[PDB]
């Protein structure tokens, strides 16, 4: 028996919030302006 052990991350393991999915919920594009509450007028 010849085998191999690797130390590192597989780049396939992560953390998901419960009840949240990527594309189960369909929607469209959004746009908004935020101001006066940041640490001057943001459009995102």
């Amino acid at each position: 028996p010849v085998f191999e052990i690797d130390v590192g991350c597989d780049s396939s393991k992560y953390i998901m919030v419960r009840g949240f999915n990527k594309s189960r919920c369909q929607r469209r594009d959004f746009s908004y302006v935020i101001d006066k509450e940041l640490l001057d007028n943001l459009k995102v």
Partner: protein, 51 residues
Amino acid sequence: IKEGLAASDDEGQFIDAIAGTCDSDCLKLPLFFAFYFSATVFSNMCSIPVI
């Protein structure tokens, strides 16, 4: 239409522009209506003494 579509609101679908004129500061209307109340009230005081 332009790029737009900031927030909107819909349930079964989306991209639904609401009909009719939208108003965010339309609230001078009660003051204008009260002053028109007063104007009509004092306009109706005038014809009776004349007659």
